[PDB]
Amino acid sequence: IASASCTTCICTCSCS
């Protein structure tokens, strides 16, 4: 639902 760097294609993932 909400995290940093870590889902496959919905909206977050990683980033620093």
Swiss-Prot record:
<comment type="function">
    <text>Has bacteriocidal activity. Inhibits bacterial protein biosynthesis by acting on the elongation factor Tu (EF-Tu).</text>
</comment>
<protein>
    <recommendedName>
        <fullName>Thiostrepton</fullName>
    </recommendedName>
</protein>
<feature type="modified residue" description="2,3-didehydroalanine (Ser)">
    <location>
        <position position="3"/>
    </location>
</feature>
<feature type="cross-link" description="Thiazole-4-carboxylic acid (Ser-Cys)">
    <location>
        <begin position="5"/>
        <end position="6"/>
    </location>
</feature>
<feature type="modified residue" description="(3S,4R)-3,4-dihydroxyisoleucine">
    <location>
        <position position="10"/>
    </location>
</feature>
<feature type="modified residue" description="(Z)-2,3-didehydrobutyrine">
    <location>
        <position position="8"/>
    </location>
</feature>
<feature type="cross-link" description="5-amino-piperideine-2,5-dicarboxylic acid (Ser-Ser) (with C-68)">
    <location>
        <begin position="5"/>
        <end position="14"/>
    </location>
</feature>
<feature type="cross-link" description="Thiazole-4-carboxylic acid (Ser-Cys)">
    <location>
        <begin position="14"/>
        <end position="15"/>
    </location>
</feature>
<feature type="cross-link" description="(4S)-thiazoline-4-carboxylic acid (Thr-Cys)">
    <location>
        <begin position="8"/>
        <end position="9"/>
    </location>
</feature>
<comment type="similarity">
    <text>Belongs to the thiocillin family.</text>
</comment>
<feature type="cross-link" description="Thiazole-4-carboxylic acid (Ile-Cys)">
    <location>
        <begin position="10"/>
        <end position="11"/>
    </location>
</feature>
<feature type="modified residue" description="2,3-didehydroalanine (Ser)">
    <location>
        <position position="16"/>
    </location>
</feature>
<feature type="cross-link" description="4-(1-hydroxyethyl)-7-isoleucino-2-(threonin-O3-ylcarbonyl)-7,8-dihydroquinolin-8-ol (Ile-Thr)">
    <location>
        <begin position="1"/>
        <end position="12"/>
    </location>
</feature>
<feature type="cross-link" description="5-amino-piperideine-2,5-dicarboxylic acid (Ser-Cys) (with S-69)">
    <location>
        <begin position="5"/>
        <end position="13"/>
    </location>
</feature>
<feature type="cross-link" description="Thiazole-4-carboxylic acid (Thr-Cys)">
    <location>
        <begin position="12"/>
        <end position="13"/>
    </location>
</feature>
